[PDB]
Amino acid sequence: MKLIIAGKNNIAVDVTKWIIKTISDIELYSVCNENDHGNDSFQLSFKKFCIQFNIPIISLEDAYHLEDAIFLSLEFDKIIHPSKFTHNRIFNIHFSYLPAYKGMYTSAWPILNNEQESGVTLHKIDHGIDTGAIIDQQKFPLDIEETAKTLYLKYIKIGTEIVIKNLPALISGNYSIVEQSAIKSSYYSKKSIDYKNLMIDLNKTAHEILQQIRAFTFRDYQLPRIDDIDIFHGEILSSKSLSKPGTILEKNNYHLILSTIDYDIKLYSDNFDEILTACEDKSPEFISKLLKTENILFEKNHLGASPIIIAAYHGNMDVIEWLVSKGVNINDRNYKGTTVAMYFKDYMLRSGNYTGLENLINLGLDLFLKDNEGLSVFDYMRKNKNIELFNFMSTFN
Amino acid sequence: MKLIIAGKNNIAVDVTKWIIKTISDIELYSVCNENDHGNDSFQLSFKKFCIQFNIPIISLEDAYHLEDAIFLSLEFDKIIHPSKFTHNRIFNIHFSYLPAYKGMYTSAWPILNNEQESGVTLHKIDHGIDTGAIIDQQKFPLDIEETAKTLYLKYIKIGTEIVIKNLPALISGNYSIVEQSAIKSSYYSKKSIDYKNLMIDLNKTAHEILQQIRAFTFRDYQLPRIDDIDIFHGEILSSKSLSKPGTILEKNNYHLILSTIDYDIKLYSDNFDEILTACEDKSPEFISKLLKTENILFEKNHLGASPIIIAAYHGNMDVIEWLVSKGVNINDRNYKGTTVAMYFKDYMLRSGNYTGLENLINLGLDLFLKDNEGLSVFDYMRKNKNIELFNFMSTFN
Numbered sequence: 119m120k121l122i123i124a125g126k127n128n129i130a131v132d133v134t135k136w137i138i139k140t141i142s143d144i145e146l147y148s149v150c151n152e153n154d155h156g157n158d159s160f161q162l163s164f165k166k167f168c169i170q171f172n173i174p175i176i177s178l179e180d181a182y183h184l185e186d187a188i189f190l191s192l193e194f195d196k197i198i199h200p201s202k203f204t205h206n207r208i209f210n211i212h213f214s215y216l217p218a219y220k221g222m223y224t225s226a227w228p229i230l231n232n233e234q235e236s237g238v239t240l241h242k243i244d245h246g247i248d249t250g251a252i253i254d255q256q257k258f259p260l261d262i263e264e265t266a267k268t269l270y271l272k273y274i275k276i277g278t279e280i281v282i283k284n285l286p287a288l289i290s291g292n293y294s295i296v297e298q299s300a301i302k303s304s305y306y307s308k309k310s311i312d313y314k315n316l317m318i319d320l321n322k323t324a325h326e327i328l329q330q331i332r333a334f335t336f337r338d339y340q341l342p343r344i345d346d347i348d349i350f351h352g353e354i355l356s357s358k359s360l361s362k363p364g365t366i367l368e369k370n371n372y373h374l375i376l377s378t379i380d381y382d383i384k385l386y387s388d389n390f391d392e393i394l395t396a397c398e399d400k401s402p403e404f405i406s407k408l409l410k411t412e413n414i415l416f417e418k419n420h421l422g423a424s425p426i427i428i429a430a431y432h433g434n435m436d437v438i439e440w441l442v443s444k445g446v447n448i449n450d451r452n453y454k455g456t457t458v459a460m461y462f463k464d465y466m467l468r469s470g471n472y473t474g475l476e477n478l479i480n481l482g483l484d485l486f487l488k489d490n491e492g493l494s495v496f497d498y499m500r501k502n503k504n505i506e507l508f509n510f511m512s513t514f515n
Numbered sequence: 516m517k518l519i520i521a522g523k524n525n526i527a528v529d530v531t532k533w534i535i536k537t538i539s540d541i542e543l544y545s546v547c548n549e550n551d552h553g554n555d556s557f558q559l560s561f562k563k564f565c566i567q568f569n570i571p572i573i574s575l576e577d578a579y580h581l582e583d584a585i586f587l588s589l590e591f592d593k594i595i596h597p598s599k600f601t602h603n604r605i606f607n608i609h610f611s612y613l614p615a616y617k618g619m620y621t622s623a624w625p626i627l628n629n630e631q632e633s634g635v636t637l638h639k640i641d642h643g644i645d646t647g648a649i650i651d652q653q654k655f656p657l658d659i660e661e662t663a664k665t666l667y668l669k670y671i672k673i674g675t676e677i678v679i680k681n682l683p684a685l686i687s688g689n690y691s692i693v694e695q696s697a698i699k700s701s702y703y704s705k706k707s708i709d710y711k712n713l714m715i716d717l718n719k720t721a722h723e724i725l726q727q728i729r730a731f732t733f734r735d736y737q738l739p740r741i742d743d744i745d746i747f748h749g750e751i752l753s754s755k756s757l758s759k760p761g762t763i764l765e766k767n768n769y770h771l772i773l774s775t776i777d778y779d780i781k782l783y784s785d786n787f788d789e790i791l792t793a794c795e796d797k798s799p800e801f802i803s804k805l806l807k808t809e810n811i812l813f814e815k816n817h818l819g820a821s822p823i824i825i826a827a828y829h830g831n832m833d834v835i836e837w838l839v840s841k842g843v844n845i846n847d848r849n850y851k852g853t854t855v856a857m858y859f860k861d862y863m864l865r866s867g868n869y870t871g872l873e874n875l876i877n878l879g880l881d882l883f884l885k886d887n888e889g890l891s892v893f894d895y896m897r898k899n900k901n902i903e904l905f906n907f908m909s910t911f912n
């Protein structure tokens with residue numbers, strides 16, 4: 119039996135990995151998105167992965183002709199018409215709790231509309247947009263400071279889990295379906311948000327504006343920009359200016375304060391670059407006063423470098439420990455899968471200071487992770503003939 | 516103590532009536548809206564009422580200078596600045612459950628946003644838009660086929676009741692306040708809907724389109740118009756056309772059927788004029804097949820004439836009884852307060868057929884209501900020297 123995975127990003131990669139691991143009786147095929155040109159970013163290129171793992175890449179037109187197959191879309195970019203296949207084993211993951219939020223921008227709209235929850239849905243593909251019957255779905259709450267990025271990452275994670283949970287049933291044909299209700303069905307088109315001329319409506323309440331701010335916060339794509347300042351989170355003040363909504367009450371390097379329909383708002387300028395630099399050699403005290411929101415402690419640059427990665431590469435031990443205490447992952451990775459341990463190893467090698475490792479191991483540092491090339495820190499130390507450091511690191515269980 | 520009532524419509528009229536009835540120790544003043552030019556419509560002119568009841572009409576500028584006063588806005592049209600008064604006894608009724616739906620078009624927005632409920636709020640006036648502290652509020656559910664008109668009428672009714680309930684406390688100064696929360700505060704401006712170029716977004720789900728249809732249904736102002744057809748309600752079909760959303764699948768004198776993102780919709784053309792004509796002399800059977808929604812049975816023309824009024828004026832007895840059985844008010848009135856009984860009297864007079872009255876009295880017909888001029892059916896029969904009919908009608912308790 120053939121399984122065609124059509125789509126992109128870590129959902130398509132991780133689903134495909136689980137299949138390779140778990141279901142060896144299956145002949146796998148890939149259909150990729152037009153904009154996937156082989157470059158990893160915040161999400162892995164499914165194209166690059168398939169080529170490296172010897173998964174044959176086929177066109178959509180080819181997939182139509184494959185008989186004895188299941189077809190599974192995961193953030194795929196082309197409309198699929200059920201009529202064009204010999205069979206009805208055509209499945210999709212959509213990033214909403216259907217029937218709500220059919221269509222586009224499902225990491226923004228629920229936030230813009232102040233939903234309490236969202237979810238992910240596995241359903242049949244039918245001819246229309248996210249209209250087909252439901253096989254399974256899972257819901258989750260939206261956090262108070264949820265952004266489009268944090269939301270999208272929850273969708274990737276939950277979607278991957280729902281596919282793996284259901285795939286044996288999709289394969290066996292032993293699943294149930296329920297037609298989507300018309301009631302509380304909703305849809306947004308690509309015209310509904312112009313990401314290339316995004317404007318925040320300031321003639322609104324504090325809460326409405328901060329909803330918009332957070333819905334448009336997705337660092338890899340954009341930050342919201344107000345009065346020529348990139349914004350990273352904000353807060354609602356207790357003051358209530360009489361000035362027209364949108365009036366700039368205060369503007370400095372740190373923030374803007376605006377009048378709204380109700381309560382004044384304070385919008386924090388983005389200082390992520392400054393946070394990264396500070397993590398090289400400054401104290402947790404210093405950093406705690408530089409940041410305006412603790413959200414900034416979990417941000418990543420275009421390579422995936424985070425505060426804790428920088429701290430680790432520079433052997434800034436007090437900052438590593440402090441970040442961990444704020445809930446940062448001691449085993450964080452950049453976008454190539456390089457781990458905190460690998461960066462810390464670099465510091466040990468460069469400095470000759472091995473004394474900090476034990477502390478990190480006790481805080482949960484995992485030496486046995488593999489990066490996107492399938493190599494561990496040990497594989498690198500061996501390749502580079504850093505045998506003394508290898509052997510030192512090897513003493514930790 | 517002085518009480519200034521600033522505003523419009525039946526809220527301002529009915530509140531003022533209760534004051535006249537209940538609180539004779541009070542010196543009343545009126546401030547009217549710029550667009551109130553003395554003409555009754557679906558709502559009474561507050562200007563006309565004040566002139567007839569010898570309530571002095573003053574300017575807003577005059578109201579600022581009145582000391583020892585309370586000021587109460589009821590759908591008033593001009594911004595009131597607390598700074599301009601000697602006192603803080605400045606109160607407003609807003610047609611939403613604040614802090615949600617500050618601003619405009621509160622009979623449409625909750626429907627457009629598929630709210631479960633709305634409400635009315637009595638609050639202090641502060642300098643901004645519907646921002647001041649809450650004194651009281653009441654909530655209610657939205658009906659499944661709620662329209663902007665039905666909603667607005669609930670607001671008028673509930674608002675009037677909340678003012679009367681609270682007015683003794685406003686007068687005594689013995690009320691409590693709570694500041695409005697920032698959370699779930701929302702606002703819409705006059706730019707948010709263009710009633711002079713209203714377009715229904717058809718590239719949406721069946722449910723989204725019917726939400727829009729109903730939010731824009733307010734006969735005195737407009738009906739929604741699609742493909743040059745005025746629409747009065749619709750329904751969601753079980754069919755699901757593949758054609759682009761908004762495609763007209765069928766168009767005839769009765770309805771349009773459109774493709775949507777999900778389920779096809781059927782939008783009923785408005786046939787209210789035909790319903791009114793039918794009520795002159797056609798059977799309930801006939802009328803039941805002419806209507807496409809029972810909502811049409813409760814509609815009124817620009818004078819306030821309804822199906823039951825027409826039936827009564829024409830002595831269409833089977834239609835009167837049938838309408839009552841569908842929940843129509845046997846004591847319905849036009850916009851001048853003329854009642855079903857008054858119209859039925861006209862039929863009796865014209866025809867000489869007195870036989871139907873007893874039936875209507877047993878169904879709840881009230882002979883003792885007064886119109887907007889303060890006259891009953893008896894007052895008219897006496898004035899017109901229709902003594903035989905007067906005396907006949909007088910036998911019913």
Ligand SMILES: Cc1cn([C@H]2C[C@H](O)[C@@H](COP(=O)(O)OP(=O)(O)O[C@H]3O[C@H](C)[C@@H](O)[C@H](N)[C@H]3O)O2)c(=O)[nH]c1=O
Pocket residue numbers: 192193194195212213221222223224225226266270313334335336339340
């Ligand atoms: C293009 C874009 C997107 N975003 C946000 C909002 C969006 O929900 C999230 C992920 O973006 P994406 O994967 O381009 O597009 P979207 O979520 O609309 O996904 C849609 O298109 C894809 C290809 C379909 O398979 C999917 N089912 C659709 O929902 O990132 C931004 O913040 N800025 C952007 O410029």
Ligand SMILES: Cc1cn([C@H]2C[C@H](O)[C@@H](COP(=O)(O)OP(=O)(O)O[C@H]3O[C@H](C)[C@@H](O)[C@H](N)[C@H]3O)O2)c(=O)[nH]c1=O
Pocket residue numbers: 589590591592609610618619620621622623663667710731732733736737
């Ligand atoms: C002008 C207009 C209104 N409507 C609907 C929607 C609106 O909520 C309802 C009553 O209209 P209205 O009283 O002009 O205006 P609105 O409800 O926006 O009230 C607003 O303005 C008045 C003067 C303020 O005191 C009030 N607090 C505001 O909410 O009728 C229509 O369907 N068509 C229209 O053309």
Ligand SMILES: Nc1nc(=O)c2c([nH]1)NC[C@@H](CNc1ccc(C(=O)N[C@@H](CCC(=O)O)C(=O)O)cc1)N2C=O
Pocket residue numbers: 191193194195196197198199222243244245246247248249306307308309
């Ligand atoms: N049948 C089907 N339904 C879907 O919802 C769907 C699939 N297939 N396949 C994968 C993905 C494809 N989604 C889309 C959505 C819109 C356009 C498109 O070309 N739209 C028009 C209109 C723009 C808009 O309103 O969004 C365009 O001109 O771009 C293409 C692919 N998708 C589910 O994820």
Ligand SMILES: Nc1nc(=O)c2c([nH]1)NC[C@@H](CNc1ccc(C(=O)N[C@@H](CCC(=O)O)C(=O)O)cc1)N2C=O
Pocket residue numbers: 588590591592593594595596619640641642643644645646703704705706
């Ligand atoms: N202080 C105060 N707040 C209010 O919300 C309020 C009052 N007073 N008095 C009665 C009524 C007045 N509402 C309004 C609202 C807007 C405009 C006005 O002129 N607005 C601008 C902007 C348009 C818009 O965005 O709606 C305009 O140019 O028309 C006037 C009166 N109103 C509460 O009912």
Ligand SMILES: [Cl-]
Pocket residue numbers: 126151152153154195
């Ligand atoms: Cl894409």
Ligand SMILES: [Cl-]
Pocket residue numbers: 467498499500502504
């Ligand atoms: Cl090494």
Ligand SMILES: [Cl-]
Pocket residue numbers: 503504505506507
């Ligand atoms: Cl060595």
Ligand SMILES: [Cl-]
Pocket residue numbers: 523548549550551592
């Ligand atoms: Cl007005």
Ligand SMILES: [Cl-]
Pocket residue numbers: 864895896897899901
């Ligand atoms: Cl008479």
Ligand SMILES: [Cl-]
Pocket residue numbers: 900901902903904
């Ligand atoms: Cl007589």
Ligand SMILES: [K+]
Pocket residue numbers: 358359360361362363377378379380381382643
């Ligand atoms: K303000």
Ligand SMILES: [K+]
Pocket residue numbers: 246755756757758759760774775776777778779
């Ligand atoms: K359709």
Ligand code: NA
Pocket residue numbers: 157158159160161162163164
């Ligand atoms: Na990528």
Ligand code: NA
Pocket residue numbers: 252253254293294295296
């Ligand atoms: Na199922």
Ligand code: NA
Pocket residue numbers: 308309310311312313
């Ligand atoms: Na767009």
Ligand code: NA
Pocket residue numbers: 406407408409410411
């Ligand atoms: Na801080």
